[PDB]
Every structure is written in structure tokens, then in C-alpha cells.
Amino acid sequence: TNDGATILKQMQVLHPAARMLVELSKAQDIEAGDGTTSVVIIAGSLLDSCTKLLQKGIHPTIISESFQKALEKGIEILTDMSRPVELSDRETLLNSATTSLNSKVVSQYSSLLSPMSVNAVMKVIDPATATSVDLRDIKIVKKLGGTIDDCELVEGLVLTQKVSNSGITRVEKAKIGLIQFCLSAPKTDMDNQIVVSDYAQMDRVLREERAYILNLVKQIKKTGCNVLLIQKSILRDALSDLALHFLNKMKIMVIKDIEREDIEFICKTIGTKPVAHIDQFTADMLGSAELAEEVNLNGSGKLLKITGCASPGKTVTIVVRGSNKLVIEEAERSIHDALCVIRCLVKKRALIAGGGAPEIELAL
Amino acid sequence: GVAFKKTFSYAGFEMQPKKYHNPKIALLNVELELKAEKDNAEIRVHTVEDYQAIVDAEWNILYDKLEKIHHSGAKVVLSKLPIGDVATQYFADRDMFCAGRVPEE
Amino acid sequence: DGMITETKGTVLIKTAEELMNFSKGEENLMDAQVKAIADTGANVVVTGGKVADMALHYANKYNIMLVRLNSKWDLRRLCKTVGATALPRLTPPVLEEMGHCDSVYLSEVGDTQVVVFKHEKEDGAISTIVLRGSTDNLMDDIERAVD
Amino acid sequence: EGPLSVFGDRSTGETIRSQNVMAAASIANIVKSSLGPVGLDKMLVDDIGDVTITNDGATILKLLEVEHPAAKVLCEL
Amino acid sequence: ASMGTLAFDEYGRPFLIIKDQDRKSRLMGLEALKSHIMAAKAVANTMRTSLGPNGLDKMMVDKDGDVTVTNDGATILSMMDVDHQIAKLMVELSKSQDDEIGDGTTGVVVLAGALLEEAEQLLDRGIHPIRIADGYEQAARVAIEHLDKISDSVLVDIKDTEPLIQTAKTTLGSKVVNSCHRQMAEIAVNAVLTVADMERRDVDFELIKVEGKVGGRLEDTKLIKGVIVDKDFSHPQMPKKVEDAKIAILTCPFEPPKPKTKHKLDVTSVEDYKALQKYEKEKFEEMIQQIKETGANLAICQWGFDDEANHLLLQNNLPAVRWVGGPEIELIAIATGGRIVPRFSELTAEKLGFAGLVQEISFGTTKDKMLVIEQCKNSRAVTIFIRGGNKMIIEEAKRSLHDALCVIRNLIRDNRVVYGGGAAEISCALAVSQEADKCPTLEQYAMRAFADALEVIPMALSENSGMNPIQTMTEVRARQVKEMNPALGIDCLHKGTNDMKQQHVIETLIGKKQQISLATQMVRMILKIDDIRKPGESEE
Amino acid sequence: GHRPVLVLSQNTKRESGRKVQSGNINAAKTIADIIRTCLGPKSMMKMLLDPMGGIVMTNDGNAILREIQVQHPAAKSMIEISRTQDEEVGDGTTSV
Amino acid sequence: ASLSLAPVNIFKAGADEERAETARLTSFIGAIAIGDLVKSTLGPKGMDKILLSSGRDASLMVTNDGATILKNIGVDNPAAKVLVDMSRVQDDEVGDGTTSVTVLAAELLREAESLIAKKIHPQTIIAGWREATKAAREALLSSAVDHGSDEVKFRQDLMNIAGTTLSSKLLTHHKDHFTKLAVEAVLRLKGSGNLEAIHIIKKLGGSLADSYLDEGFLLDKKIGVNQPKRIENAKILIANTGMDTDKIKIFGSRVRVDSTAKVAEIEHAEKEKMKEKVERILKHGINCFINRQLIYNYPEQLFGAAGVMAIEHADFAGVERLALVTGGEIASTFDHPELVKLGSCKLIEEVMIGEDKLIHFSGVALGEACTIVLRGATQQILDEAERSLHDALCVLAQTVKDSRTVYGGGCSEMLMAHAVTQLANRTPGKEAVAMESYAKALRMLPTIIADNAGYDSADLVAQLRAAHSEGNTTAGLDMREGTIGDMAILGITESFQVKRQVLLSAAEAAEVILRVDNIIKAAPR
């Protein structure tokens, strides 16, 4: 890694001043987004100067007030040196992204990553009347294989979950439906048992179980749904073999084991409203999409892609590729740095020259 | 006569009178508590009315034991088995004395 | 004690009346059994197993002496010496199975509490030698000499 | 040990008297079997196989390895 | 002089008698007596500096490092981790004195130590220890008779509590809570007199709830004629103050009924489910309405309750308290004059307790709430609430107030008193010495040793107060002999006078008699032991 | 501490009575039985391994007895009388 | 003879005993060590400490609070334990004065050690100290001034007290801003003393001057999936119901049927029961529904279909604070909509703070509950900001409860010392020396305050003693320049309760420690 915050937090420092510097890096990463190394260098140099200041016989309280005065003056100087910017100027955004990426391993792939980062930021916010960017709306997916040149900016969502309905893929004009109930035998929250005292009852048990499952699948199919997402379930089996077979026979692509924390992102991306009871499963709660397909990444795994959505949400997903895991992690960190730079450009839209110019101007 | 230590009184024991001038003593080997009828007893009901009836039946069994003890004319009740808080308060309300887990000797 | 099933005994209560009457009926049954035993003239009961609390209470009510011989050998020897037969159930004994003895009492020898089944006649099926002594080893040696 | 504060053991009263009598009786019983015409000799192995067969009391008590002072008194006697 | 026996036979064969006799230890006769006397003297000399108003405290630390600062003799000796058996005997003697009396737990140890110290030189002079014990018993009988002679009676009437207050003040004078001397004396006297059967019967200490909370000041300690409960109102929006509350004590959780017997309720249809849910809702509404119908304003439960019942109680304007302990339930029922009701069906108006004010009390910036119930009509239970600057002084105040309560209880049991400050000990020593002169020669030594041992308490008091022991004790004894006044003691507080009757230094006669008796019996036991057989294994 | 106190030193054993006599007689009988078969014109020879690595193939009783080591003192006395017989007259060692 | 110095060994292995001089030595050493450690963190120019834990996590904590310093250390000296418990109890009673009371107790015990070295019985010292405590308490009470009647004067007093409390802490950099912050936050409580109604939210990043008091309220929870994220003219209902597969509370209930169709019917009945409960809630006419417990998927979907915000898993503190800030009633049954009060606020929206999203309540109805956002550069800075602000809020709440105030900067300590000295000049015996030592410690407190700033402490303290002698009863240490001045003019004010508690607790602990002449330790476990 080259990120200052990552370097500082990765190695145990064991010294209280160093731990406070690590916390400082974390704060700079949280608020600004980059500059996590420059802030630590500045703090270290300030304390190093404080050594000679103290040796001269200056109390470490006049030093603090003088440093506060210097900080105020320097903030004024930097503000005076800044230049206004607007989000409609794509060139400045591209320059900022390229400058952020210039010091990372993806400096060579910046020509692809910087426009990707700018588009990712601008596609999840409203350019007018925006004060901050929620980077949780930009999901980053790391898939091993290929090179960094294979990074892609799918507009919809990509799910690492595989299609249980082996045999049917690439549904066109998909009508995606997200359910939060279980497609298995009936079961109540309170304790329930079925007692059999006759062979006719024993046959009727599985007969009526089959009828109930078939009715559930028919109700799902009648709405016009053809792609089904099933939330992950622990207490009760989410998708039984009978339910999967019935869904397969009606040409529906079933995707199960959807994580609970991913529901909000999926609903925002597609427009599908979650359903928890089959009674309320209607056609208007389905998320229309242009194409939902499962693509294999040249033998390095399978990714499920849903590209094209009616009334698309304000979320984008970035697929990061690399030869080995380390470069993938560093590429993810660098892309995050670029996104953070664009975000902190969204608020306080002011630009300054880099290249050490602000520091030397402040010194003079 | 006989004297023995106080044996783990429950709540409401301090409300019982602690001196009687001609008490009739009820010597018992009985667990006066709300508990299962038997360790291998199971109750099976399918109606809320039967549920309420079962609860009232347990309470009425305990109260029948207590009332049978009370109507005997005894004022001091000693048992080799535990005497619950409900029974202790019942005896307190009647100005009676109770003591559970009295040693066999 | 009242005999129990051998597979599994579950008291299935379905109404409040059964719940209220179960304990009363069980106690009445045990009392009837003990009174039926006592009505045959028996005044001493020797059992080879555990003694129920209600059984003990009703035996006390009818003035019946209870002895609990845990070991089966002692039970057989008492049956031999008294003339009774070990009944397998709690049914009252018939005249031929009825046990008779001249005197049964609780006595203390030294500091040991003993129960004595004593015949006035100088006969019977089993005779006992009561060994006294000042040491356990001395009594053991005397017992070896007796053997 | 205690208020006397001497680095060693101490026996007082009937205990030490009994110990002295026991030591003297041990020495006596060592040689009691070698008295009179119906007495018998003794073998004394000297820890390396050397054998001394004797009936004389002085030789037996001199060759023995004694530690109790009240018994050394009898040996020297 | 140890290790049992070691002879290994005259014939050289092994001689083993006792199991593992080569590692055991034993002691015989006179040196065993000397070791016991030395251990008892060490314990007594350690304890004698905590005697009188000028006595100092001991900082006691347990295994876990928790620290307690105390002056109580029984507490000090209980906290000690001793190994000598005689030390354990001394600790048990202090525990006995605390159990029977509650005061004088330090005087008994000093008296026993002095008795054994005199017995040491008596034995060195060649006297059988049984003779010493018999002489000690005779002198103790004489001293107890003299104590009965010079005793004085006090009134234990509720109308005039001045002698009781003086006795409580004398008891508390040696504790750290003497900064609020008369206040603690008054609260202790009132607490004991409130909860007591006036026909010279017992005082049930379970009706006195002594509870302390940090913060505030020691002067903030007050007597509450009611109950202090660590709980608060269940709903945060329930009112914090109820006036003229009609208490409703219940031991049934505000939940749907549940049979004790193993039960199963079968739901076989949708109608069954609807009936079940309607039954639950109706049970909640019915229980709340049953509580309300009696006219109660407050509800006290023992086993807690759930959300629906909580909101129904709040909605119906019934403040409620849950998870109240059984002892607290009983105390509240006793104080408010209300019955304890096991289920809602039996609740009625006549079983409702009445309290003048029920309030929730805050304790600064601590978030910890606490409930107060007081202003009852004829409360037969009382609560003592102790405040302080740290938990150590709180515990010390707890035990000091317990000592005061025990002293007033002893006064109720028997109202005869004797005058303290060493006056009683000096008079008893004089009586013993006078009785010795008429006694035959051989027991005179034991009688005079007992008198000298009795003299230790005034000397200890004078030493703790900085005065010269021998001169002051001799002068006070001479004054007692010259003019007949058994009330002359050691002016520990330097008030100018030596008459303890004017200084109002009063102790219970039972306390002195118990001190002398217990010390004599324990000294007799210690003198009668002439053999010890410890395992001597020094095991881990 | 408190080391044991006793009359005789440690490692000092003592046995008495019929046991000692029986042991002495058994030791003498064992000594006799060692060379019982080396007597007469039809005696067999014995091979003895010297601790210094030598070999003594001999029929004489005295050499056999003096080349072996024993711990029982009665056996030592028997070996001594064998040597005495050998020195005094020259032969008759395995007969005595 | 003593237990330890006896020919017989009377103790278990590992247990010891310390007699008079040794016990006094250990107690005094521990007390002086505690006092020297806690001091130098006193007064406006005090410095902070670093508490580096030895545990596996090795928690790092920078602090200026005396109570936190004393509680988070390994103490083995029993007298040091007594002082630590004193500091903790002082913190519990009031939020300030922990360092002051600890230092005062240490100085008192140092003077006690000197007096014992001068051959004075400790009971005489204790009696003299009791008299001195009475005199000092009476003088301090007579010196108190109350301004609760006048609202503007009381506001000025609150500002001065908050500034004085925050002067010694890390917030002294922005003392003015943080003083306004704390005063407004306390005044919003409308007289209630529950500091738990004030929530302190620490968000990493930003300057320390970026901290602010939200005009409404902030919640750190999240909204459902298909529910509105912005509501105007909200009608909030606060509840504490199940909403998680709500089971009938009959423990022994079970389903025993002979067909799976009946099982499906029972499941539909359960879902219909949940739907009916949701409809009963919606009958209240609400916009935002806040439940203390979890809300599963079916009720969340039902709320979303009705366009009702549903905030879930707002803990007990959350629902209490929302009820305080909006005026709603925390309900658990919904059969009487007319008997349930509904909270109201102008706007509910999601606000972006740092890299986290929070729910913002704006234009609340009551507002008797505050949220304070703290921004900092390090976690330690945020922790100290929270601790210092807690101290300020505690002192302000105490002042609101009891409006009597005294002058700080050493003025109060010097006036009590003057009263004690005047009493001492009126008493014969060594008790006069004890009272003189009491006054000496009382004067040593502002001496340490002056030492912490590097000033000429001896000269300043002598000047203060003189000025109080001629009758200047408001003179104190002017820490801006290093002179003496009028604390009435300079506005250096303190709560009377805090100073009274400090004095009384210090005297109490010194008295209880001095009474000990023997320390006995059991064998450690």
C-alpha cells in the first residue's frame, strides 16, 4: 500500500504519540479523503520544530497559542490562494482525479480510472443542490483475474451470488422480484407439529404440501415476474427443492442467499420493493430491467449483471480486476482516494495548485 | 418441651404473631406450595376456558389444603417439607404461625 | 407403595376436575390398600423396598409396625424363620401365607439399635447367636470359631 | 524455634529419659544373646565384605557404628 | 520437643504408631501453656489500642485487596488471617460477645489477655493451672455480684429518651461517627424504640433496614419511618411523586396466567388463534381494571411485568414498581399496614396499604434512582439511610449504628446500667481484693491476679488518652476507696472531673457481666489445654 | 529439619534366630553343590571367566571356588576353608 | 509485644502486619504519592496525563480529569485506595473538584505527618481539624452569593461557572464557544436534572471548533427500505412493542393439526394478526413510528406501503430522549388512540455527518433533550472533549438546582484559611497548631495552582493572605498575567455546593486515614 492511513493503521506502533498520529490519519481520511500522509508529515515536522523551541526556554503553552495564530493565518492565505470551481467543469474534476491517482500503482491506468471515478461520483448525486456524497452508494466489487485494464463501470448492480436455476440464464426484459419470505413447507412462528394417525393423512400431508408450494409459485408467476431474488434465511429453508423445480418449470431465474444488509442497495438500484408476504406480492412491486445475465470472467469466476433499468437509481458499481490480490486491494484504495477527492470537491468547491506550492507559499 | 432454630422463613413471615397462649399445633409432612401435581403429570387442553380452569384448579387445590389446615383449629403449623410464600401469607392473614423445612428429629 | 407401570407413566389431565381429584383418589386408594392389609389381623409389615410417605402415614394410623429389609437374603431368612411368603404385590396376605412370631420389638444393645424377631419356643427354622465383645477383631475371631 | 532461640533440637523431661533408656536397652539387647556357655557367636560384616565372627562383648560394641551418646557411654564402658 | 515419638524399638525394628508421625508436631504441659499465653498476649496487645474515645482504628485488607477501616473489635478479629489456634479462640470469643451483646467486643480480648498474662507468672510460681482457673471463676462470681450491687436503673419510656440517648452516645463515642454524635444516638434510639415489643420482649432487627449510599455528607444520615427501595417507577413517564398513596402489594407478575404443571395448549384452527389472542388481551385489560377498581394509586409487584401491562398502568394513572425483593415487599407491607395479595382476583380495598408520600430520589450526577416510602400512619418498620464521602466510612457508620441498636436492645431487655470509663472495673477489682483477704492463702494469689487483670481496662484507657497509666489508675482507685463512689473512672476526654455519673458515661450491666463471664470461661479453656498435635505438614 | 535420631547408624541391618542358621546352612549347601560334580575320576571340567578377561578351564575345586565371588559370609568361610585345605596338604579341596 | 515481633508465629503464610510508625509511614507515603500524581493537573495552566493500559488492547487515554486518572491505575496502598474512592464519590456527587479534593486531602495528611513528627497525639489533630472544618464551612457559607432571582444575573453566573470549569481542560482553546454550548444545552433542560437527556455524539474528523449543539435532535438509527426519508409536519408515535414475529405470551401454546393446510391457515392468521396490529397503529394518524425493539420485514413493508417512517431498534435511552424532545408517549398498546399523546416536529431528514448518516429532527415541540456533536482530530481529543463537557454540564446542573455561588481562583480557599487561622489564634494547646496546619494546606491549594503556571507562588499567596487580612474578601489569583485581582470583576465563579463538598470530603478522608495505627493484610489470593 501507499495510502498513509492504511500504512499507519496496519503496523502496530506501541507509542502513544504514534497512536495519536494514526488517529490523526484516520480523521483526515474520514473528513478530507486523501492527504493522509501530508498531515502526518506536517505534524511530525511541527513537533520536531517544537523540540528546538522548547530547548530555547519557551513554555509549551505560548507555543500552542502561536501555532493557533499561524494556523489561522495559513488558512486565510490558502483561502486567498484558492480558485472557485463548479461541478459542470469536467476538466477540473478529471485533473483532480488524475492528480490523486498520480502517486499510486494505478498511475498508468489513470487514463481509464479517472473518468471512471468522475462518472461514478456524478452518477450518484445531483450536480445542483448537493452538499455531500455518500460513498456507500458506490459499491466496489473485487474479482480476481485479468488486469487493471479490465475495470468496468456497470450502471446496474452485480451480485456475487450464483443462479440456483442452473439451465436458464440471461433473462431479457427482466421483471425482477425481491421476496423476504421462505418458499418451503408451511411453518408458524409458534411451535407447530403435524400428527398423523392414518395412512390417508400421511398421503394428504405431502399432497397438500405440494399443492401449497405450487400455489405459491403460481402466485409468483402470475405477476409476470421472471427473475426472483430471495433474502437469506436461517431459521427456515428459503428455497426448497420442490419450489426450485416448480420455478424452473415456469422459466424463472432464481437467485437465493441475498444478504439482509444488501436489500436497501438492491432496492435503490433496481426499484424493486421487498415483499414479506405472498398476499402483497403484486406486479407493481417488481423492478423492471433491460437485461439480467450471468457472465463468466474468462474462467476466473461468474458474475451476475443486471444492466439497464427503468427509472434507474442513484447508485453505481465498480468492478475491479487484477492479476493478484495485492494489486486489486491497492487499486480499490486508489479508486476510493479518487472518489474521496471528488467528494471533498463537491463540498467547498475551491481548487488550489498542488506540487508543493501551497506549502511553500504558507512558509513564505 | 422442644426448641429449634428458625428455618428460612419466606416473605410475609414477620407479619405473623410470635406468641400464643394455648396453641394447637399441626404437625405435617406436606409441601404447601404451588407446584406440578406430579413429576410425570402433563396437562393437555385445547380451549382458553380450559386453560383458565386449570390455573384456577391449581390455585383451588392449594387453597383447599390451606383451608383444611386452617379449619382444624390449629394456630401453629410445622412441616417437614417447604412451605411457600403463598401459604406463609395465607397463614399471616389468619394470624397463624408457619415454619417449613423443620428437621425430622 | 402403589405399583406403577413398567413402560412409562404419564398422568394425562384434560379437565380441571381430574386435576383436582387425582391426588385425592390416589390417597384414598393407598388408604384402602393399607386398611385391607390391616383388616387381616396383620400388625407387622416387612418390605424389601422403599417405603412411601403416604404408606408410612397410613400404616401409623392403623398401628402397623414397618421394617424395611433392604437385602434380599435377609428377607428370605426372615420368611424362613417366621413362616411367611414374600408377596410380589401389595395384596393382603391369605391365611397360609400369614407370618407369625412370638414377639417383635425395637431394642438397643450397647449403642446399636436392633429389631428382634423372637420366638418363645426353642425351635424354628433359623437361630441367631448374638456376639458381644470389646473389639471388632475379637468378635471376628469368635465368629470364626463359631463357624 | 520459640523464645529460647537455639539452632537445634531440645528434649526435656520424661522424653529424654526414655530415649536414653531405649538406647541403653538396645545396646544390651545387641549382646544379650552372647552370654553364658549356651551363648552364640555373631557375624559382623564390615560393609566391604570383611567378616568378623566373635562372642566378645568389647569387640562387638567397638566394631558397631553407634550414634546415640547414651549408647556410646555403654560401649566405652 | 516435637515430632511425636522416635525410638525405632529397642531391637531395631520399625516402630510406627501414628500415621505419618515423622512430620507431625506436639507440645506438652508448661511450655504449651506459655505459647498459648504468648499468643493471647500478642492478640490482646494488638487490640488494646482501639479502646476508648481516643482509641485508634485498624486498616484491614482482605485477600482481594478490598480495604476496610474499622474500630469494632469483632470485625477486626474476623478480618484477621490468623493461624494459631489460640488466636482463633480469641476471634470466636469476640464473635460470641458481638452475638450476645453487640458491644464490648474489644474489652473481652483485653481482659482475657490480662488474665492469661497474670496466669503466666502464677504458673511460673508453681501453681496448678486448674487452681488458677478455679480462683478466676470465684473472683468472676464476686465481681458479677458486685456489679449487680452497684448497678443503677434507667427509664426506657418513650416519653423521656434522655438516658437512652446518653447510653447510645457513650457507645458511639469511640467510633468515627462521633462527629454527628447526638444525631446518630437519637436516630438509633428512635429506630430501636419504634420497632420493639414494649412488654420487655425482643427487638426484631429484621424490621430495621440499614442501607448506605455514597455522596452527600455524614450529617445527611437520617431516620426514615418507612422503606427505602433501590428500584424506581417502571415507566420513565410515570410521575415521580405520589401523595396519600393507596399501596397495592402484589406477588403476581402482570403476565397471562401460567400453570405450574407441565401443560400444553393446542391450537387447531384459526378460531383457536383468534380466541387465544383475544384471551391474552382480555387478561391484560382485566388485570389492570381489577387493580384500578380497588381505588389504589400505586402498585408494587415482586416479579416484574411486560410492556402491555406497563403501558396500561401508565395510561390508567397508576404508578407502579416492579422487581421488588421479598424482604422489601414484606417491609413495605408491614410499614404501610397493607396485606400481601397473591393474585388480582383476591385484591380488595381493605388489603391496600396507605403511605403519606412515595417519591423517587436522585443522587446528583449518578443516574441512579431510589424510591422512598414514608409518612405512614403507624409504621412498624424503620429504615436508616446513611450518606458519606466514601464507602469505608459508610461501612463503619453501618457497624457503629448496629452497635448502638444492640446497646438500646440490651437496655430494653434489662434496664440496669453501670458507669463506664473504668469505674466499674476499678470497683470490681476493689471488691475482689477485699474478698481475697478473707479467703484462704492459696486462692488469694488467683483472686489478686484476677483483680490486677481487671485493672488493665482503666490503664488501657489512660494510655490511649496520653495520661500516665499507673499514677492515674492509683489516684482514681484511692479516691474510690476514700469516698464511697463507684462512679469514678478515667477522664479520657479531659473534662476536668472524674465522676462518670456527671459525664454520663453509661454502659449496660449485661455488657459488663457478659464481658467478665466470657473472658473467664475462655481463659479457663486456654488454661486447661496442655497438649497440641498439629499436622505440621506446612501444606500449600 | 528435625533429622531422625536412633541408636545405630543407618544402613545397619540385623537378623537373628532360626533364619540366620537356615541361611548359613543353605549358603554352605550351595557352595557344596557348586562343585559337587567335580569329584572323582569321571569328573567334568568347568570353564571360569576371569574378570581380567582370562579363562580358567579347570577341574580342581580350590581354583573354581577362589575364582568366584560371593556376598554371603558363610560362603566366604567355605571358600576360606577350601583355600586352607589346598595350602595345608595340596589336594582334597573339593572333598572337604 | 506485637503479633509480628513475637517468638511464636501467629499469622498465615503471606499475611503480615504493620504497627504504628510503619502503618503511618505507609499511609502517608501512599497519600502523598496520590496527591503528587493528581496535582500539576490543577488550575488553568494544568497539563494532561497519558494513561497507557497494560492490557491486551492497550487502551490509550489522555485526560485531565482527576477521577479518571485515579480510577484507571493499579493501586495497592490502602490509603491510596481510600483517596481514590474519595475522588470517585466526589465525581459521583458533583462533576468537578476531584483533583481539588484529592490534593487537599494529600496536603492535610502531609501536615498531619509533620505534626506527628512533632510529637502530637493524632486525636488532638483530629479535634483541631474538626474545629477548623466547622470554622471554614461557616466562613464559606457566609461568603456565598445567590443570583437565582435575577435571570440575567443568573445567566451571567452560569456563563462564568462554565468558563471556570472548562478553563483547566483541553476545551480552554475554544472556551467561549464551548461555554455558550454547555450553557445552552443545560438551559434547554427546563429545570430537569437528568444529564442523560443530553446526548454527546463524537464524530471523528473536523476541527474541535466545529462542535455544535443541534437545534433539534439527532438519532444514529436508520429507516426502513420502502419508507420516506423526509417528512414535514411529522406526527411521531413512540412505542415499545414487539414487531418481531409477535408471539402470544402463553408459554404452553402450540399448534397441533392433522394437515399442512391447517398449518398454512394458522400462518396466514399470524400474518393477519400482525397486519391488524399495524393497522391499529396507523389508526393513530401518524407519519413517523419509532419502536424501541426490532421491526421485522412484514411490519416494515406494511409501514412502507402506508408511507410511514419506521425507525427501529431505538434503545431505552433513544425512546426516552425522543419522548423528552417531542412530547410523545411511549406506548405499548394501541386500542385507545385518543389517550396517546403524539410527538411533533417540523422536519425529519437524513443529514450527512463525517462519513456516517444520521436522522435529524428539526423544529421539535418540547426540546427538553439535547444532542451535542463533537468533532476532533484524534479519538483521545474526542474523549477529553466529552469528559470536559460532561464536567461542565454536571456543574451547570448543580448550579441550576442550587444557585448559591462562591468565588474561585483561590479566593474561597484563602478566606476559609483566614477564618481557620483566626480561630487558631483563639485556642490554646496543640489544637491551635493542628488548625494552623489545616489553614496551611488550604493555602497550599492555590499555591499549587500558582506553581502550575510557573508564577511566583510564594509572593502571590502572601499577597492574597494579606489582602484577605485587611478585609478584601474577593481577592484571588489573576491567572491571565500573574497578579492578584477581583474575582467579582473578572467573573471567576464556582458552585458553592462543589466547594463545600470538596472541603467536607477532604476533611473526612484525612480524619479517617489519620485514625489508623495498624494495617493488617490477609494472605493474597
Ligand SMILES: Nc1ncnc2c1ncn2[C@@H]1O[C@H](COP(=O)(O)OP(=O)(O)O)[C@@H](O)[C@H]1O
Ligand atoms: N466518654 C468516655 N469517657 C471515658 N471512657 C469511655 C467513654 N466512652 C467509652 N469509654 C470506655 O471505653 C471502653 C471501650 O469502649 P468502645 O471502644 O466504644 O467499645 P468496646 O468496649 O467494644 O471497646 C469502654 O469500656 C468504656 O468504658
Ligand SMILES: Nc1ncnc2c1ncn2[C@@H]1O[C@H](COP(=O)(O)OP(=O)(O)O)[C@@H](O)[C@H]1O
Ligand atoms: N480562570 C481561572 N482563574 C483562576 N483559577 C481558576 C480558573 N479556572 C479554574 N481555576 C481553579 O482551578 C482549580 C482546579 O480546577 P480543575 O483544574 O478544573 O480541576 P478540579 O476542578 O477537578 O479541581 C479550581 O479550584 C479553580 O478554582
Ligand SMILES: [Mg+2]
Ligand atoms: Mg493523494
Ligand SMILES: [Mg+2]
Ligand atoms: Mg463499645
Ligand SMILES: [Mg+2]
Ligand atoms: Mg584330589
Ligand SMILES: [Mg+2]
Ligand atoms: Mg474543574
